[PDB]
Structure formats: C-alpha cells, structure tokens
Amino acid sequence: RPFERDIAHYDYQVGTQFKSSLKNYGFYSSAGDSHQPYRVVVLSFELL
Amino acid sequence: YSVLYNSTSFSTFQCYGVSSTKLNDLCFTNVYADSFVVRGDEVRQIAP
Amino acid sequence: NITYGSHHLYVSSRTRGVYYPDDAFRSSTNVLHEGFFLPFDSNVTWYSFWNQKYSVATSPFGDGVYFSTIDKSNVVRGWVFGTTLDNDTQSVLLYNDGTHVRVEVCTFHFCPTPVFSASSPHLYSSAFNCTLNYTLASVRADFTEVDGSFKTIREFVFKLQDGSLNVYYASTSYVLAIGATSQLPSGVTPLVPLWKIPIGLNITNFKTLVYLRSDNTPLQAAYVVGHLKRRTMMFKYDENGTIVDAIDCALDPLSETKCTLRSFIVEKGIYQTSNFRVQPQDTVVRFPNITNLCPFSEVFNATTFASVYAWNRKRISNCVADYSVLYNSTSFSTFQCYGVSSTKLNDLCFTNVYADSFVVRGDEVRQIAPGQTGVIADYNYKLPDDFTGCVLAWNSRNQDASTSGNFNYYYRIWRSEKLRPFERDIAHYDYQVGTQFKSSLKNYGFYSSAGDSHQPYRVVVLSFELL
Amino acid sequence: RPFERDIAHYDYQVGTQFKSSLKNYGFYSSAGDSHQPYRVVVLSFELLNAPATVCGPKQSTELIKNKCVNFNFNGLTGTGVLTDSNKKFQSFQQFGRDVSDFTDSVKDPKTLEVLDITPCSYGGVSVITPGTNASTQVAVLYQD
Amino acid sequence: AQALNTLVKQLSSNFGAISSVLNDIISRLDKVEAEVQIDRLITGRLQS
Ligand SMILES: *[C@@H]1O[C@H](CO)[C@@H](O[C@@H]2O[C@H](CO)[C@@H](O[C@@H]3O[C@H](CO)[C@@H](O)[C@H](O[C@H]4O[C@H](CO)[C@@H](O)[C@H](O)[C@@H]4O)[C@@H]3O)[C@H](O)[C@H]2NC(C)=O)[C@H](O)[C@H]1NC(C)=O
Ligand SMILES: C=CC1=C(C)/C(=C/c2[nH]c(/C=C3N=C(/C=C4\NC(=O)C(C)=C4C=C)C(C)=C\3CCC(=O)O)c(CCC(=O)O)c2C)NC1=O
Ligand SMILES: *[C@@H]1O[C@H](CO)[C@@H](O[C@@H]2O[C@H](CO)[C@@H](O)[C@H](O)[C@H]2NC(C)=O)[C@H](O)[C@H]1NC(C)=O
Numbered sequence: 031r032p033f034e035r036d037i038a039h040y041d042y043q044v045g046t047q048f049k050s051s052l053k054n055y056g057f058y059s060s061a062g063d064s065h066q067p068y069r070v071v072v073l074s075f076e077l078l
Numbered sequence: 079y080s081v082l083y084n085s086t087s088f089s090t091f092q093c094y095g096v097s098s099t100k101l102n103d104l105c106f107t108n109v110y111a112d113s114f115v116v117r118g119d120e121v122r123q124i125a126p
Numbered sequence: 127n128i129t130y131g132s133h134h135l136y137v138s139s140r141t142r143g144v145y146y147p148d149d150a151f152r153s154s155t156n157v158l159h160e161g162f163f164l165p166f167d168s169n170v171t172w173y174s175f176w177n178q179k180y181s182v183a184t185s186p187f188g189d190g191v192y193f194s195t196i197d198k199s200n201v202v203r204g205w206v207f208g209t210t211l212d213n214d215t216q217s218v219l220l221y222n223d224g225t226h227v228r229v230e231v232c233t234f235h236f237c238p239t240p241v242f243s244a245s246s247p248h249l250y251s252s253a254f255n256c257t258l259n260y261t262l263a264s265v266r267a268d269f270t271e272v273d274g275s276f277k278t279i280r281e282f283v284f285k286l287q288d289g290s291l292n293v294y295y296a297s298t299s300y301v302l303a304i305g306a307t308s309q310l311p312s313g314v315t316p317l318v319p320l321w322k323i324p325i326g327l328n329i330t331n332f333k334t335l336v337y338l339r340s341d342n343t344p345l346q347a348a349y350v351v352g353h354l355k356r357r358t359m360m361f362k363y364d365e366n367g368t369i370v371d372a373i374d375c376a377l378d379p380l381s382e383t384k385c386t387l388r389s390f391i392v393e394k395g396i397y398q399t400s401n402f403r404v405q406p407q408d409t410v411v412r413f414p415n416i417t418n419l420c421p422f423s424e425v426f427n428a429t430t431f432a433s434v435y436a437w438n439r440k441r442i443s444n445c446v447a448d449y450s451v452l453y454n455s456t457s458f459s460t461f462q463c464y465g466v467s468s469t470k471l472n473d474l475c476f477t478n479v480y481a482d483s484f485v486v487r488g489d490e491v492r493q494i495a496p497g498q499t500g501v502i503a504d505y506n507y508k509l510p511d512d513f514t515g516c517v518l519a520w521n522s523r524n525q526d527a528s529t530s531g532n533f534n535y536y537y538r539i540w541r542s543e544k545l546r547p548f549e550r551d552i553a554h555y556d557y558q559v560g561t562q563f564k565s566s567l568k569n570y571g572f573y574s575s576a577g578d579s580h581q582p583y584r585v586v587v588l589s590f591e592l593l
Numbered sequence: 594r595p596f597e598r599d600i601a602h603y604d605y606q607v608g609t610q611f612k613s614s615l616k617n618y619g620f621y622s623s624a625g626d627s628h629q630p631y632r633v634v635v636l637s638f639e640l641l642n643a644p645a646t647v648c649g650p651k652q653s654t655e656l657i658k659n660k661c662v663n664f665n666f667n668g669l670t671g672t673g674v675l676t677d678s679n680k681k682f683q684s685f686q687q688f689g690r691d692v693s694d695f696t697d698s699v700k701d702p703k704t705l706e707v708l709d710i711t712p713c714s715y716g717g718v719s720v721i722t723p724g725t726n727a728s729t730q731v732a733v734l735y736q737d
Numbered sequence: 738a739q740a741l742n743t744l745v746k747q748l749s750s751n752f753g754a755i756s757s758v759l760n761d762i763i764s765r766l767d768k769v770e771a772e773v774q775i776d777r778l779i780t781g782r783l784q785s
C-alpha cells in the first residue's frame with residue numbers, strides 16, 4: 031500500500047527451494063549509469 | 079533549494095500537486111522526507 | 127504459360143459490400159458508420175472464366191478492395207498481395223491448398239501468371255526471408271469440377287489497418303445460369319469479420335489465384351473486384367444482432383434525407399439535409415519554391431559550442447528544414463517539441479526560426495523544458511511557459527570531452543534573481559559565500575571516462591513563429 | 594506506416610554515390626548507456642467481446658447471486674445483482690449490452706452460463722412524511 | 738432567494754479541478770498547469 035514499509039525478514043518458495051525475499055545490490059564503481067547507485071529523497075507536502 | 083546547487087547535482091527534480099517553480103513562494107504545514115537508495119534504472123519507479 | 131485471352135465486363139455493384147464495422151453486439155438500432163465502404167450502384171469490374179477465358183490481372187488495392195466470386199467448383203483458390211509481386215519486395219500469399227487456408231508472408235520469386243495445376247501448386251519457384259507461415263482455418267475444398275449452373279457467391283472485403291490485413295467474409299446461395307446476364311445479387315448480405323492477419327506490409331496491388339485442369343484450361347467461374355471509398359453509411363441492426371438493411375448516404379437525395387435523420391422510413395414532408403453528397407478527392411499542396419537546405423552542418427557540427435550562461439542565438443531563414451539529413455551523422459538523444467508535433471514538422475512553414483546552442487551536463491538536459499527548476503533553468507537558460515519550438519540534444523563526447531578533461535565550458539552557479547525567459551547574463555561578478563567571495567561562474571570538467579550523467583551534451587533549442 | 598515492416602535490401606543515392614540503406618550497430622562492451630544495446634519488447638493488447646486468451650494472475654471467487662455485489666468477469670468490472678439468465682447469446686462472445694451501453698448480461702468463464710446483471714435498487718422509492726416538528730414516523734411507497 | 742443562494746453555493750464546486758479556490762490553483766501551480774484547472778473552473782461557473 032502507499033507509504034507502507036515492510037522490514038520483516040522471511041523466505042519464499044521458488045519452485046521447491048526456499049530463498050530469501052531480500053536481494054543484494056552490487057554497486058561497482060565501474061558500471062553503467064543504469065546500475066550506478068542513486069540516492070532518492072522524496073518530499074511530502076501538506077497545505078492545510 | 080538553491081543552497082544545494084553548488085554541491086548536489088539533481089538528475090531528477092519532479093514535483094506532483096505543486097509546481098517546482100512555485101516552491102520558493104509556498105509555505106507548507108507539514109513536510110516529510112523519505113530517503114533510500116535504488117538502482118539507476120529504478121528511479122522511474124518512484125512516481126505515482 | 128497461359129496464352130488464352132481475357133474478358134472483363136463493367137457491371138453495377140448494387141447493394142453489395144456491406145460488412146460489420148466493429149465487434150459490439152448491437153440490437154434494434156440504426157447506427158451511422160463512417161469509413162471505407164463500397165459505394166452503392168458504383169462501377170465494379172466483372173472478370174469471367176467460362177468460355178475458356180483467363181482473366182487474371184494485377185488490380186490496384188487502393189484503400190481496400192471488395193472481392194466477390196461466383197462459381198460452382200471452387201475455382202478461385204486465393205490471392206497474392208504486395209506492391210511489385212517480385213522478389214525485390216515481400217508479398218502475402220493467402221490461398222487454400224484443399225485442406226487448409228494458409229497465409230505466407232514471404233519473399234517470392236513468382237512464376238509468370240501464378241496458378242494451380244489441379245491440386246498441384248505452381249505459384250512460386252523459391253521463397254526466403256519469410257516472416258509468416260501458419261494456417262488460419264481447416265476447411266476442405268476439392269478441385270473436382272462441378273457441372274451445371276453457378277450455385278453460390280462468396281464475397282470478401284480486404285482492408286489494411288495498423289499493418290494488419292482484415293478479411294470479411296459472407297457466403298450466399300445464388301443461382302446464376304452460364305449464359306445469363308452477369309449481374310450481382312440484390313438485397314443486403316452483411317460480411318462478418320473473419321481474420322486479422324498481422325502481415326506488417328505495404329499493399330498497393332493484388333492478384334487473384336485460380337486453378338486450371340490438368341490440361342491447363344480454365345474452369346467456369348467469375349470474380350468481381352470493387353474499390354472501397356471514403357463513405358458514410360447507416361446500418362439497420364436486427365433484434366438478433368445481424369445487419370438487415372443499409373443506406374449509402376452519398377447516393378441520392380432520398381438517402382441523404384434518411385441519413386440526416388436516423389430512420390429508414392421517412393414520413394411525408396420537407397426535410398433540411400446535411401451535406402453528404404460531395405467529398406474532397408484531391409489535395410492541392412502549395413509551398414514556396416525555396417530549395418536551399420538549412421545550415422544544420424554549421425550549427426550542429428561546430429568545433430566549439432557556447433557555454434550555457436553565454437548561449438548563442440542564431441537566426442535561420444530562407445531555407446528548407448529537413449531533419450532527416452541529420453540521421454546518418456547525428457543521433458539525437460532528445461527530440462521534444464512544444465506547441466507543435468514533431469511528426470508535423472515536415473508539413474509546416476515557419477515565419478521566424480531561432481536556434482539557441484549551448485553545452486550542459488548529461489543530467490541537466492531535463493532542465494531545458496518549460497516550467498523546470500534547477501541551476502541551468504534558474505540562472506543560465508530559461509524557456510518561456512508558452513514555448514513554441516523543439517529542444518534537440520545529443521551526446522557529444524568525441525568533440526567536447528578529452529582524456530585529460532575539457533575545461534572550456536562554464537555555467538552560472540548563483541544570481542541575485544532568477545532569469546526571465548530567453549534572458550542572457552554574461553557579466554562577470556563574485557558573490558558572498560559566508561564571509562568569502564567566490565566567482566559566480568563554475569567550470570565543467572568533461573572527462574572522456576565518465577558516466578553519461580557527467581558526459582557533455584550539446585543542446586540546440588529551436589523557436590518557431592506561426593503568423 | 595504504423596506496424597509496417599520493410600526488410601527489402603536496396604541502395605539510395607547520397608549525392609552522386611550509392612550507399613546501402615542499412616547501417617550497422619557497433620555494440621562495444623565499453624561504452625556509455627546511450628550507445629549500449631537495449632532489447633525492446635512491445636506488447637499490443639485488444640479488449641473486445643471475445644473469449645479471453647491472455648489474462649492476469651487474479652484468483653477467482655465463488656458466485657454470489659440475488660445480492661448486490663461487485664463483480665469482475667474477464668476484467669470487466671461492475672456492481673449489480675446477479676441472477677440466472679434464460680438469454681441465448683452468440684458464441685465466442687461474452688457480455689450483453691443495451692442501447693444505453695449498460696451491461697445487463699455476462700457469460701460466466703467457468704460454468705459457461707449467462708447471468709443477468711440488475712442494478713441495485715433500480716425501482717423508485719418515495720417516503721411520505723407528516724413532517725419534522727410533527728412526527729418521526731414515515732410511510733414508504735415502492736413504485737411499480 | 739433560493740436560486741440566488743444556489744448560485745452562490747455553486748462556487749464551492751471543483752468541476753473536476755484540483756480545488757474550488759482560484760487562489761490555491763494560482764499559487765500552487767505555474768501558468769501552464771494552472772490554465773487547465775482555471776479553464777475547468779471557468780467552464781463550470783459559466784454553466785452555473
Ligand atoms: C534587472 O536588473 C535590475 C537592476 O540591476 C535588478 O534589480 C536588482 O535586483 C537585486 C535582486 O533582487 C536587488 O538586490 C536586493 O536588494 C535588497 C536590498 O538591496 C534586498 O532585497 C536584497 O538583499 C538580500 O540579498 C542579498 C544577496 O542578493 C544579501 O546579501 C542580503 O543580505 C539580503 O538577503 C538584494 O540585495 C537590487 O537592489 C536590484 N537593483 C536595482 C538597481 O534595483 C534585477 O534583479 C534584474 N532582473 C532580472 C535579472 O531578472
Ligand atoms: C481461400 C479463402 C477461404 C476462406 C476465406 C474460407 C472461409 C470459410 N470457408 C468455409 C467453408 C467452405 N468454403 C469452401 C470453399 C471456399 N471458401 C471460399 O471463400 C473459397 C475461396 C473457397 C474455395 C477455395 C468450402 C467447400 C467450404 C466447406 C468446408 C468444410 O466442410 O469445412 C467457412 C465456413 C466454415 C464452417 O461453416 O464451419 C469459412 C469461414 N475458406 C477458404 O477457402
Ligand atoms: C526467478 O523466479 C522464477 C519464477 O518463480 C523462477 O523460475 C522457477 O524456478 C523453479 C526452480 O527454482 C522451477 O521449478 C519453476 O518451474 C520456475 N518457474 C517459472 C515460471 O519459470 C526462477 O528460478 C527464479 N530465478 C532465480 C531465483 O534465480
């Protein structure tokens with residue numbers, strides 16, 4: 031759901047094996063811009 | 079946001095519900111900031 | 127091969143060629159449909175195969191064709207669609223082999239006068255680079271000759287939309303004598319949508335395929351070819367969903383009266399009618415006779431570009447703007463037009479054209495747009511909100527980047543106020559950062575070994591006027 | 594033209610010389626992302642009154658009839674009352690429409706039966722009041 | 738009196754815009770984005 035955060039650690043079934051649902055980012059310095067790490071800052075505003 | 083110009087070069091500045099050129103004349107009642115790191119090709123997914 | 131002569135007639139189409147224009151199940155409604163239809167009581171060419179006369183010719187396709195065959199022994203086997211029907215172009219081969227209906231988009235070296243010899247096919251000598259081969263339906267149609275009179279009429283409408291060949295089909299029982307007058311049946315027989323074949327081709331001509339006997343003599347048959355035109359029609363839908371009546375609104379004043387209302391029955395009276403009779407048939411293009419091409423090599427292939435704070439404006443006039451010239455040399459990573467469509471640029475004439483050229487970073491190309499916020503938009507180059515023109519950018523690392531690094535490009539980091547649209551500030555001054563004074567102009571470091579967000583990009587902004 | 598493919602080999606005149614109209618991509622592994630090769634897959638969809646061939650991974654639910662419920666048949670959503678139908682409808686087509694483009698009938702994908710769709714509270718309801726500051730009792734007229 | 742009061746009360750309708758207040762639309766968006774919402778409000782109020 032929007033603005034929902036799930037930090038629980040659990041595994042899921044891929045066929046018959048169980049693999050972790052968290053995957054790792056490999057950020058090498060010699061790579062393309064589509065694989066370069068990007069820092070994203072999201073601002074939310076209210077005007078009440 | 080003009081303070082950050084000499085240090086941070088923004089590859090993405092997209093505003094929703096407000097215009098980015100109008101940000102210097104608006105006062106907000108509530109502001110949240112969400113920070114994370116994604117891949118370069120996943121920046122397009124941070125949008126409604 | 128087939129040295130026999132031909133025999134073509136000229137009959138009236140009457141009230142044939144009606145097909146379903148959509149897929150919805152409608153009922154008890156009179157619906158106006160606009161599109162490509164066979165006009166009522168129009169010229170249609172009749173080609174006869176009885177009396178041993180071979181009448182196959184390469185008819186033009188146009189905006190769709192109406193095909194109707196009248197036979198008794200399944201003489202017409204299929205069709206060949208294409209442009210030149212040679213081996214330099216790709217052609218569609220839609221036919222029946224006696225057990226299936228096969229479509230083969232394929233590059234054929236067609237035999238002269240392609241025809242079947244009984245069940246043996248003798249269409250093409252060779253085929254290659256052949257992007258479609260599958261069967262549409264499993265129907266049986268033998269090559270045995272049936273004696274007597276003509277029994278059924280099979281009607282077709284072939285249309286091209288979105289690179290797909292749409293086939294509409296209807297079969298009706300129609301008894302016609304061998305020596306009788308060649309004429310089409312009466313009434314309305316709607317053609318149901320049969321197939322959508324993704325041929326992905328350009329079709330301008332089509333040829334019919336028939337089958338002969340083992341002695342290579344034509345059988346008794348006849349086929350009619352009509353051409354669809356841009357027409358407005360009204361169809362009457364039955365309560366069961368079928369089409370039972372049709373009106374061509376451009377035929378006569380009575381049909382125009384029926385089309386002005388939404389009824390097939392008009393009461394006694396005088397009715398004002400909307401214009402359905404006349405449609406434009408020709409296009410008169412009149413452009414000024416200037417022949418010079420615009421100096422795109424002078425601006426796009428310049429040795430050095432201006433900096434973004436000191437962007438260069440150039441006036442373009444008395445020339446033809448052909449952007450397809452730049453395709454073999456310049457690869458545009460950004461072609462965004464405002465106020466006009468980029469696909470419409472080849473059909474437009476501009477009273478005034480300006481060209482603004484500068485160099486920014488790779489990630490600052492997004493700031494060259496109306497209503498943007500950033501260092502370039504605030505302090506270097508701002509577009510108006512009602513901007514009419516196109517923004518052109520392309521990566522230039524073979525020109526404006528080096529291994530040691532290019533440092534000849536500058537941008538303004540600070541101003542006392544945001545720039546107005548199309549305003550340029552080239553004054554040199556310093557500003558206070560805390561207690562120290564630093565220059566308001568910062569230097570671009572364009573190394574050849576860097577990411578595309580830091581690679582130098584050459585931006586050309588065109589401004590148009592339509593007065 | 595849209596969705597048109599031209600695979601013919603031919604040459605064109607560049608000034609006075611003739612050059613091939615096909616140009617070659619050079620995809621080096623050490624290059625920027627603007628010159629890196631990209632694989633593009635373009636999907637084309639159609640939403641007609643035809644049987645579903647490709648659909649999404651959404652789990653089905655048991656039928657509820659004679660009740661005002663939300664429904665989802667072959668991606669066609671809506672809200673109404675489902676009832677058993679005596680309608681006979683043409684094959685290789687799914688839902689029935691109206692002159693006002695209101696979906697009144699739909700073929701079930703699993704049981705292969707047509708069901709009516711009746712809008713919830715389609716009849717007129719009138720309330721008769723002696724008036725606030727006179728009473729709180731009301732009388733209800735269910736029209737027709 | 739009821740017709741005049743209804744005409745007054747119809748000024749609080751969005752008519753498909755982001756807000757029924759013209760000042761919020763003007764102060765939150767730039768000219769191009771605010772033109773659409775102001776045109777929607779103008780069409781609704783002209784209809785009223
Ligand atoms: C077109 O040219 C005109 C004339 O040159 C120019 O007007 C100038 O605008 C600046 C920026 O608004 C004005 O400077 C401001 O003036 C007052 C007091 O002097 C204050 O509002 C500002 O001081 C703040 O900002 C300073 C840094 O900018 C800080 O050091 C200070 O502590 C304050 O925070 C600021 O100095 C300037 O007075 C006018 N000049 C004249 C002659 O009117 C205008 O901006 C140009 N328009 C463009 C480029 O669109
Ligand atoms: C080549 C085009 C071609 C088309 C478009 C075609 C369509 C077509 N042919 C059919 C039957 C038939 N139509 C034909 C024959 C023909 N029908 C024709 O339009 C033509 C040109 C022939 C002859 C080559 C015959 C003999 C049958 C009966 C086949 C059967 O028993 O299934 C049917 C009805 C199927 C049914 O009722 O189950 C369709 C839809 N068949 C074709 O062969
Ligand atoms: C990525 O996910 C897919 C889909 O779950 C995995 O494909 C399955 O792999 C298992 C074995 O691991 C097979 O038994 C299944 O038949 C596969 N399903 C499909 C739909 O292909 C795939 O293995 C995963 N890849 C990883 C984890 O590297």
Ligand SMILES: *[C@@H]1O[C@H](CO)[C@@H](O[C@@H]2O[C@H](CO)[C@@H](O)[C@H](O)[C@H]2NC(C)=O)[C@H](O)[C@H]1NC(C)=O
Nearest residue numbers: 080081082083084085086558559560561562564
């Ligand atoms: C970039 O600009 C910011 C904003 O002006 C500078 O930050 C100021 O730096 C001065 C000098 O050190 C300090 O006195 C101020 O307190 C700082 N202000 C803020 C808000 O941080 C920053 O130094 C500049 N960076 C450069 C020039 O590299």
Ligand SMILES: *[C@@H]1O[C@H](CO)[C@@H](O[C@@H]2O[C@H](CO)[C@@H](O)[C@H](O)[C@H]2NC(C)=O)[C@H](O)[C@H]1NC(C)=O
Nearest residue numbers: 419423451452453454455606607608609610612
């Ligand atoms: C790219 O295309 C342009 C435009 O057709 C070519 O420019 C022409 O080049 C020929 C010689 O090859 C000259 O005679 C013409 O006068 C040029 N025309 C224009 C309009 O400039 C250009 O050579 C092509 N570049 C290639 C193939 O590398």
Ligand SMILES: *[C@@H]1O[C@H](CO)[C@@H](O)[C@H](O)[C@H]1NC(C)=O
Nearest residue numbers: 135136137138167168169170
């Ligand atoms: C089409 O048929 C009509 C019928 O009257 C005829 O007059 C006309 O000449 C025909 N057109 C051609 C091109 O044969």
Ligand SMILES: *[C@@H]1O[C@H](CO)[C@@H](O)[C@H](O)[C@H]1NC(C)=O
Nearest residue numbers: 212213214234235251252253
């Ligand atoms: C293509 O057709 C030409 C005649 O136009 C012929 O000479 C040539 O052999 C053909 N090439 C093939 C079939 O590869």
Ligand SMILES: *[C@@H]1O[C@H](CO)[C@@H](O)[C@H](O)[C@H]1NC(C)=O
Nearest residue numbers: 127237238241242243248342
């Ligand atoms: C002549 O027609 C026969 C069968 O009708 C076919 O096999 C042959 O290829 C044709 N001749 C040429 C030169 O294509």
Ligand SMILES: *[C@@H]1O[C@H](CO)[C@@H](O)[C@H](O)[C@H]1NC(C)=O
Nearest residue numbers: 233254255256599600601602
């Ligand atoms: C077309 O055929 C020729 C000759 O066989 C071949 O060289 C070429 O690669 C083919 N092109 C395609 C697109 O299949």
Ligand SMILES: *[C@@H]1O[C@H](CO)[C@@H](O)[C@H](O)[C@H]1NC(C)=O
Nearest residue numbers: 230232252253254256259260
């Ligand atoms: C199309 O497919 C059929 C069936 O596999 C094959 O016999 C025929 O040669 C193919 N036609 C071509 C490649 O032109």
Ligand SMILES: *[C@@H]1O[C@H](CO)[C@@H](O)[C@H](O)[C@H]1NC(C)=O
Nearest residue numbers: 363364365366367368370681
């Ligand atoms: C509609 O179809 C039914 C069922 O086949 C048939 O009895 C009826 O006559 C048809 N109605 C019309 C008007 O053709």
Ligand SMILES: *[C@@H]1O[C@H](CO)[C@@H](O)[C@H](O)[C@H]1NC(C)=O
Nearest residue numbers: 423424426427428429524525
């Ligand atoms: C760019 O165009 C100029 C025009 O004078 C030409 O000399 C040059 O070769 C072109 N190419 C490059 C890579 O500079």
Ligand SMILES: *[C@@H]1O[C@H](CO)[C@@H](O)[C@H](O)[C@H]1NC(C)=O
Nearest residue numbers: 644653701702703704705706
């Ligand atoms: C599955 O679909 C078939 C028709 O394809 C239908 O007969 C059947 O009832 C459906 N459900 C189950 C549970 O098999």
